[PDB]
mmCIF file of C-alpha atoms and ligand atoms in Angstrom:
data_model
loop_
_atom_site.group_PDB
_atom_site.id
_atom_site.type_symbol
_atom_site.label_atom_id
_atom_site.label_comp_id
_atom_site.label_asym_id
_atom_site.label_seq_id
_atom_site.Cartn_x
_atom_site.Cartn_y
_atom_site.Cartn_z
ATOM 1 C CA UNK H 1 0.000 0.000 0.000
ATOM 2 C CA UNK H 2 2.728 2.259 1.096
ATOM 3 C CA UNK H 3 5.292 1.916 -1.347
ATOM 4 C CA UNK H 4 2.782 2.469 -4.511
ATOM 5 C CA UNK H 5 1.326 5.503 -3.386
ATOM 6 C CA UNK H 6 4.800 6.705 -2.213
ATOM 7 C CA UNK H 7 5.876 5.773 -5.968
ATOM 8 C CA UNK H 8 2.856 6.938 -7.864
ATOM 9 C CA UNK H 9 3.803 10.591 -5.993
ATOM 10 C CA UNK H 10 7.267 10.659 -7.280
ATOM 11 C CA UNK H 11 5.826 9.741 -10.602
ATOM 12 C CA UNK H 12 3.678 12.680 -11.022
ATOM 13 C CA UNK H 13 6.373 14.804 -9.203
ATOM 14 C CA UNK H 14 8.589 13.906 -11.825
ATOM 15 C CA UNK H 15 6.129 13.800 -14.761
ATOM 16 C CA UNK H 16 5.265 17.325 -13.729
ATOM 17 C CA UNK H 17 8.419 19.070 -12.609
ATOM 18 C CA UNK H 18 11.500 16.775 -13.388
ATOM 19 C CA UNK H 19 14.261 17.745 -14.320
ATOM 20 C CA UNK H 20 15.476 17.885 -17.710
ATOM 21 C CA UNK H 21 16.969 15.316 -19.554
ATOM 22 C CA UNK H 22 15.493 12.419 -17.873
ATOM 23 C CA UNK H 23 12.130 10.767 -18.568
ATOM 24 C CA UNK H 24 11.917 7.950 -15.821
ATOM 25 C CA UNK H 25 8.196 6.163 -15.035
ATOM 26 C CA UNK H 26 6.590 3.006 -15.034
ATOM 27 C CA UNK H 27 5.513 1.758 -18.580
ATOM 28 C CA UNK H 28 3.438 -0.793 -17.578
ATOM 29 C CA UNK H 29 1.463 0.081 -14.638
ATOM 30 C CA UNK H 30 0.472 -3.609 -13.675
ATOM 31 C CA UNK H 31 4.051 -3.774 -12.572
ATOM 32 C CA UNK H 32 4.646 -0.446 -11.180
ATOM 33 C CA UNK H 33 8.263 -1.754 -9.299
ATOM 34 C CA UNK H 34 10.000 -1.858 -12.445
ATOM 35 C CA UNK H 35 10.567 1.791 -14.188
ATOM 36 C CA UNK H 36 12.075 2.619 -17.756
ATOM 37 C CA UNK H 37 13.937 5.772 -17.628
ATOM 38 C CA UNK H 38 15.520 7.207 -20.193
ATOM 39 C CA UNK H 39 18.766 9.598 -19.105
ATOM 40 C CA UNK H 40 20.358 12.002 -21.835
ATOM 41 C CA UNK H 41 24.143 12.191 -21.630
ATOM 42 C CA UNK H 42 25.619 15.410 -19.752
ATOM 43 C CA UNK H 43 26.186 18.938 -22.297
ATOM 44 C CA UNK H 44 30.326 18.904 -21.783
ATOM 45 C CA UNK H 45 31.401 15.179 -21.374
ATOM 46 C CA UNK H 46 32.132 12.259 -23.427
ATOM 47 C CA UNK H 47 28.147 11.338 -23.446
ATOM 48 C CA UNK H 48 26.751 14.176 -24.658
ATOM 49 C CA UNK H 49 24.304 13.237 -27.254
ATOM 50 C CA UNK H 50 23.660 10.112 -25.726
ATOM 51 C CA UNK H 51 20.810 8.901 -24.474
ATOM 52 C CA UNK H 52 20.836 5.454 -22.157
ATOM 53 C CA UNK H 53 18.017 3.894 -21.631
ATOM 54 C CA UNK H 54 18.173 2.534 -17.681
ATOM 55 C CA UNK H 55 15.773 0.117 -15.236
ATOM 56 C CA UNK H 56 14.695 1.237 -11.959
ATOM 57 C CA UNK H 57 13.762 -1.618 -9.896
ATOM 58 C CA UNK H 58 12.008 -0.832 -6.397
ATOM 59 C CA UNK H 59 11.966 -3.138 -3.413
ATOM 60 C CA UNK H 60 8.117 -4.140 -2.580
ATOM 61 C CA UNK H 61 8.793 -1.750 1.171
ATOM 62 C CA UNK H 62 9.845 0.979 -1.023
ATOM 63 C CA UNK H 63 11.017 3.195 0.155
ATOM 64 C CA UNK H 64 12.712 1.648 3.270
ATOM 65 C CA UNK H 65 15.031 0.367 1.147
ATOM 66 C CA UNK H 66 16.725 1.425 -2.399
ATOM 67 C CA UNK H 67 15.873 0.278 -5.876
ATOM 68 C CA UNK H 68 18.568 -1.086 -8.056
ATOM 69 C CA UNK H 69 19.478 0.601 -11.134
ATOM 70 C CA UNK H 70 20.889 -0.924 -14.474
ATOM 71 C CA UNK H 71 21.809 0.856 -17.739
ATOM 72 C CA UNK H 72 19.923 -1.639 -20.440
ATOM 73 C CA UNK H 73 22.996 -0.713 -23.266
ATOM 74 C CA UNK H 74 26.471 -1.355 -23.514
ATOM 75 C CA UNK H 75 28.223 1.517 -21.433
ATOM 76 C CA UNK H 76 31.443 2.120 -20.210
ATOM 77 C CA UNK H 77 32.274 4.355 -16.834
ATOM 78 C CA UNK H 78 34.039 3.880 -13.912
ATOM 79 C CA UNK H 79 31.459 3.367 -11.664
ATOM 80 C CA UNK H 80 29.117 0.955 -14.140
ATOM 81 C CA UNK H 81 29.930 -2.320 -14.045
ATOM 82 C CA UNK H 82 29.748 -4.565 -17.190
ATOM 83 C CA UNK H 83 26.617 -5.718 -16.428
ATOM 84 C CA UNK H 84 25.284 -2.066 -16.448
ATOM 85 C CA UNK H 85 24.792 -2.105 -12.800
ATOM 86 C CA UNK H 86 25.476 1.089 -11.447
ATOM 87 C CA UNK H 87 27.524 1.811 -8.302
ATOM 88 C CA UNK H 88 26.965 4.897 -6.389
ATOM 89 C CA UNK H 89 26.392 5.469 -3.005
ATOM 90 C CA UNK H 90 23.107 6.920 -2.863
ATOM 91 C CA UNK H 91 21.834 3.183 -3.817
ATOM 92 C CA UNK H 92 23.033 2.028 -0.714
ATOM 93 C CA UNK H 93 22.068 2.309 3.139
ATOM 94 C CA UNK H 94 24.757 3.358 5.628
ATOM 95 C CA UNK H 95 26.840 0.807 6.600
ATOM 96 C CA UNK H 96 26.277 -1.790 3.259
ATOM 97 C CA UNK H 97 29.525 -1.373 1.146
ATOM 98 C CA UNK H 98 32.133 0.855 2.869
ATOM 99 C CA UNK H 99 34.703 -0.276 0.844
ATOM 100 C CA UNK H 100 33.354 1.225 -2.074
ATOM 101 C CA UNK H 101 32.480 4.867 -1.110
ATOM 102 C CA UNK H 102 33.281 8.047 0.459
ATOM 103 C CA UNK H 103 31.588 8.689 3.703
ATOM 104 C CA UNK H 104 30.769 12.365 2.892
ATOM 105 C CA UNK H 105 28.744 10.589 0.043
ATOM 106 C CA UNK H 106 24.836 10.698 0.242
ATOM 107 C CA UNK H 107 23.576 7.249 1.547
ATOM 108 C CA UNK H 108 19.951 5.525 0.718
ATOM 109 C CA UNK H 109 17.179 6.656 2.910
ATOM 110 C CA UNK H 110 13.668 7.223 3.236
ATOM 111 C CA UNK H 111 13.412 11.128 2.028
ATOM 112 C CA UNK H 112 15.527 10.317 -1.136
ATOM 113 C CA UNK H 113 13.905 10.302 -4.046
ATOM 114 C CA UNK H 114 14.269 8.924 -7.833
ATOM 115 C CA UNK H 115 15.197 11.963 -9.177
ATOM 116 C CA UNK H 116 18.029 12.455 -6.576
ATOM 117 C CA UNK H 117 19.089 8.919 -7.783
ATOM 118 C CA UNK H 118 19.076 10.342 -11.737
ATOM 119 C CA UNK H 119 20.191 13.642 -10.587
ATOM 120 C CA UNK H 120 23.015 11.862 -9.388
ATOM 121 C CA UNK H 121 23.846 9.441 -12.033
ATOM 122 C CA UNK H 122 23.970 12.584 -14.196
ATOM 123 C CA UNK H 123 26.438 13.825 -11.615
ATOM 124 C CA UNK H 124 28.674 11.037 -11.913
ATOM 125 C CA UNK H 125 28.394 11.010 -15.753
ATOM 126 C CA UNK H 126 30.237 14.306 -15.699
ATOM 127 C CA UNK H 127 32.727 13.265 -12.611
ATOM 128 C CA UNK H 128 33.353 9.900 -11.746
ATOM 129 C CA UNK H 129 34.036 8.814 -8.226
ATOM 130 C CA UNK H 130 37.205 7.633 -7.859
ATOM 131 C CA UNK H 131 36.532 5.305 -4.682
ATOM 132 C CA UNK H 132 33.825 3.200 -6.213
ATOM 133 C CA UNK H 133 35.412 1.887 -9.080
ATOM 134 C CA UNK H 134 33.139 -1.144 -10.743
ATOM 135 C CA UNK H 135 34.594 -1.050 -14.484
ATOM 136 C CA UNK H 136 38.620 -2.011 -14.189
ATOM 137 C CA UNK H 137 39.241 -0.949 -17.678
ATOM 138 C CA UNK H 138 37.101 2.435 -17.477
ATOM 139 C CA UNK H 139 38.759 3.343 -14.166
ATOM 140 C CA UNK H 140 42.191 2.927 -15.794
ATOM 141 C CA UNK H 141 41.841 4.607 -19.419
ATOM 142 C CA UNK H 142 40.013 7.067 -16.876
ATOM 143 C CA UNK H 143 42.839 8.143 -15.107
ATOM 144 C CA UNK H 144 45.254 7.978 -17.628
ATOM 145 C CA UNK H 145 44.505 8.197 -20.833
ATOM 146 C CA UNK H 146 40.896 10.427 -20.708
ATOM 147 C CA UNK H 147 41.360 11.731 -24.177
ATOM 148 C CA UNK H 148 40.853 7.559 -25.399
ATOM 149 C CA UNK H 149 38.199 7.006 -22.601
ATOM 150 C CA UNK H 150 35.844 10.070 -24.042
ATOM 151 C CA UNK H 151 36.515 8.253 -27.941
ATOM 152 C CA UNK H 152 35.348 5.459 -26.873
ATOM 153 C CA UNK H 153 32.489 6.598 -24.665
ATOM 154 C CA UNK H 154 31.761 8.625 -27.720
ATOM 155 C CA UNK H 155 32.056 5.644 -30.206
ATOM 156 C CA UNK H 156 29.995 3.429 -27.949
ATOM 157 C CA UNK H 157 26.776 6.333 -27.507
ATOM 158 C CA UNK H 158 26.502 6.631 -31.013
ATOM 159 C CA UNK H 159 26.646 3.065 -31.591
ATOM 160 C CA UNK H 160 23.382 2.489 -28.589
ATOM 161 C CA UNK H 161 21.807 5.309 -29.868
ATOM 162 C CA UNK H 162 21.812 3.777 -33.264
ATOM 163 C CA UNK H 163 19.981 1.003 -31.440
ATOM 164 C CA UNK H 164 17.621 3.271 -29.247
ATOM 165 C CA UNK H 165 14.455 2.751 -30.798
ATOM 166 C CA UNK H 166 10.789 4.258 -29.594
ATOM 167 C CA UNK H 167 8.626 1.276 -28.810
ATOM 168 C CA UNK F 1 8.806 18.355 -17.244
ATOM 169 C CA UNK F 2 5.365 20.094 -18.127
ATOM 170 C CA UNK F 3 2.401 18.075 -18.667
ATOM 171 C CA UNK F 4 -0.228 17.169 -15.792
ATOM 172 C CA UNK F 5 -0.121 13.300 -14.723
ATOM 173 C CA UNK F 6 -3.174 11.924 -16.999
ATOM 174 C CA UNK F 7 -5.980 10.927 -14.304
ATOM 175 C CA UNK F 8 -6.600 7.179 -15.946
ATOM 176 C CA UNK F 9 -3.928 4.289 -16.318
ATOM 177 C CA UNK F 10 -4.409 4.062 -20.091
ATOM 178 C CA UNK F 11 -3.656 7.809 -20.057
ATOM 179 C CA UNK F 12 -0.338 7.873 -18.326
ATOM 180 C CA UNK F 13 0.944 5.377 -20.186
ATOM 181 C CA UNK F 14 -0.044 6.844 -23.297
ATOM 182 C CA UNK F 15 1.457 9.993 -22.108
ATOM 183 C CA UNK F 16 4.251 8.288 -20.865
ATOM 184 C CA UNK F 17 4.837 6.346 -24.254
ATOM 185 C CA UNK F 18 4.879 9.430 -25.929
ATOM 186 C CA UNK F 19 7.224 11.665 -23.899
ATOM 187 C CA UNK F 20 9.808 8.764 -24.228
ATOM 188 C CA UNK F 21 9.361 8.998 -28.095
ATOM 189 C CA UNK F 22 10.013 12.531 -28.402
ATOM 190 C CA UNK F 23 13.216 12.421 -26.822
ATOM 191 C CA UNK F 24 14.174 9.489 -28.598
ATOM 192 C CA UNK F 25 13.399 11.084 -31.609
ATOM 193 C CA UNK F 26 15.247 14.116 -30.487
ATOM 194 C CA UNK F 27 18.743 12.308 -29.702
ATOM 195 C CA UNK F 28 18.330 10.693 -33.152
ATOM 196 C CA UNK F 29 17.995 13.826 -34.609
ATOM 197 C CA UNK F 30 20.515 15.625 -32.649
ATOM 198 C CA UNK F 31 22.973 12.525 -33.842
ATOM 199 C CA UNK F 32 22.073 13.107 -37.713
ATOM 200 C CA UNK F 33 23.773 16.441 -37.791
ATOM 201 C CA UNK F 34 27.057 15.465 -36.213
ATOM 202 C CA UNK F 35 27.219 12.378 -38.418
ATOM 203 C CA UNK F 36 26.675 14.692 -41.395
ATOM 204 C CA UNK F 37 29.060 17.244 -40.437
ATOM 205 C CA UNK F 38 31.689 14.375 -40.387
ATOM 206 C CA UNK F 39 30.676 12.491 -43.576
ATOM 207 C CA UNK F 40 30.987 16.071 -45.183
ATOM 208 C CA UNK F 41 34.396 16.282 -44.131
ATOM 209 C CA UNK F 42 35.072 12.781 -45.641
HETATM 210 MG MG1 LIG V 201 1.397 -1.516 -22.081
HETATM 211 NA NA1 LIG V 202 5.715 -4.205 -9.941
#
């Protein structure tokens, strides 16, 4: 009961007053835990002019705990594994991975939101965080060699793109 | 974002369907003109 009415208000919220260059929802509202979002790449990086498509899955308690979220294209970033699975703190409650990221960072809880999760993503799009590294070869070319890590995160969004289909 | 949340399930998803086409279409579009700038200079 909770969780759909809690995610039904951050769908209007978002339908209504998002942010730019993210269209997140649920497309089938039969299963309203699983959303299709849509991000466009940040103006200034390597993924500008992309646009990844991305699943939201949300926890039945929602939101006591996180969703996971998974770019559904082939992507490469520090902080996304190969799977598409993406790694940032905000997807996690204090205390579950502290290995992986900075304290400072923003942790799961109940009074975040989806759009703090894309705002976010967007974030790390532009700046990777170097303590939650995910994708070995990203977080190397990364580092040191950026000028080949932005041609091939440009060679790969125009190749998804290419693929990125309305349906 | 700028349109009201439809009031009916079949509405949203239309809505929803739609909004996800236009900036599909949009990237696409975006992408055209950088490929053509390069294929010019080829
Ligand atoms: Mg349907
Ligand atoms: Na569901």
């Amino acid at each position: 009961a909770m969780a759909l009415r809690r995610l039904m208000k951050e769908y209007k919220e978002l339908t209504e007053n998002g942010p730019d260059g993210i269209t997140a929802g649920p497309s089938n509202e039969d299963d309203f835990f699983t959303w299709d979002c849509l991000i466009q790449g940040p103006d200034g990086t390597p993924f500008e002019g992309g646009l990844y498509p991305a699943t939201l899955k949300f926890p039945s308690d929602y939101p006591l705990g996180p969703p996971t979220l998974k770019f559904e294209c082939e992507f490469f970033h520090p902080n996304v594994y190969k799977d598409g699975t993406v790694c940032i703190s905000i997807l996690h409650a204090p205390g579950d991975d502290p290995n992986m990221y900075e304290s400072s960072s923003e942790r799961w809880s109940p009074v975040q939101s989806v759009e703090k999760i894309l705002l976010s993503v967007m974030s790390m799009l532009a700046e990777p965080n170097d303590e939650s590294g995910a994708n070995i070869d990203a977080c190397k070319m990364w580092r040191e060699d950026r000028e080949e890590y932005c041609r091939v995160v440009r060679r790969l969004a125009r190749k998804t793109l290419g693929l990125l289909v309305p349906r | 974002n700028r349109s009201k949340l439809p009031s009916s399930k079949k509405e949203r998803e239309e809505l929803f369907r739609k909004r996800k086409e236009e900036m599909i279409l949009a990237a696409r579009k975006r992408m055209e003109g950088k490929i053509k700038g390069e294929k010019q200079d080829k």
